[PDB]
Amino acid sequence: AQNPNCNIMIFHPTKEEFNDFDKYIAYMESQGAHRAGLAKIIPPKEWKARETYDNISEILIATPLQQVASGRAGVFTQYHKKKKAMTVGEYRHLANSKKYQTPPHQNFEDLERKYWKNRIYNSPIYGADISGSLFDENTKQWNLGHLGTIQDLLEKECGVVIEGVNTPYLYFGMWKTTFAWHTEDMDLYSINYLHLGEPKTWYVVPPEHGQRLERLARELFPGSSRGCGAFLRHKVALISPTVLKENGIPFNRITQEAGEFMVTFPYGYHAGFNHGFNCAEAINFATPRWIDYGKMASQCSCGEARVTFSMDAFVRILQPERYDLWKRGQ
Ligand SMILES: O=C(O)c1ccnc(-c2cc[nH]n2)c1
């Protein structure tokens, strides 16, 4: 078996290897990449997402979210308080202000220590899930706005045409901006490109060990767990690497820098934080190997998890027994 320790693999495709997205995903899996839950892909030195990031300041963050924490430094939840709209230019200025700017640090490990020590005592503001793309329409390879859709993949594998669309999202981050422990909707894959700015540190649990994280979360967030049998779908819970290690949870970490792709694999739990002002683009995708994961994905019928119109059909086709209850919660 490839990659039995479930380490995060890093790939350096040639320009030739970079010409067929599905084929390279499959190659990575042939080398055991998926066992870690996360892989990094460094694009060929020849490649670029777009020419310049000069003229992005006028994009609108219609609903910036302030991420307010409750709990302890290593075990906390966060809720999203809506703020007034601002442009990316205004958001960048805010990110770099004294209140929000990255503090001095020696290296990534030092900044990580500061993050887990102090995150809960600040409330950074995030631009999240903004439909759009910063890829040049002329970029022909690994353009996240030109992938094949999940709906077409489900039709190709299962024989049934479904409604729905599948488009990328932009994320504008600042220091301490946080993404909670989660797997993707329907335990899909995701691909994330860091377009510009400061890094993003990721934590990931191997898919074969996802249930261990779920058990620990139920212990650490007991009220949340009683309210919803899949409360990690709410995407509000944070658990530090120190607490994970104390509880024997297998995990790995890696820092993504501008110009790098990260792929998240089905049922790979992940979380992380931004180092400073940055912009990332992400989208979910599917392969034939995903189908069996989508059939088994847990669902929140709490009401709390955010439903896209596109997910209805995945539950309807792949999980007909669960569909009624899930639909009520949406
Ligand atoms: O903020 C980010 O960079 C980030 C990282 C990993 N996952 C998501 C996500 C959003 C919805 N599903 N997954 C967003």
Ligand SMILES: [Fe+3]
């Ligand atoms: Fe994600």
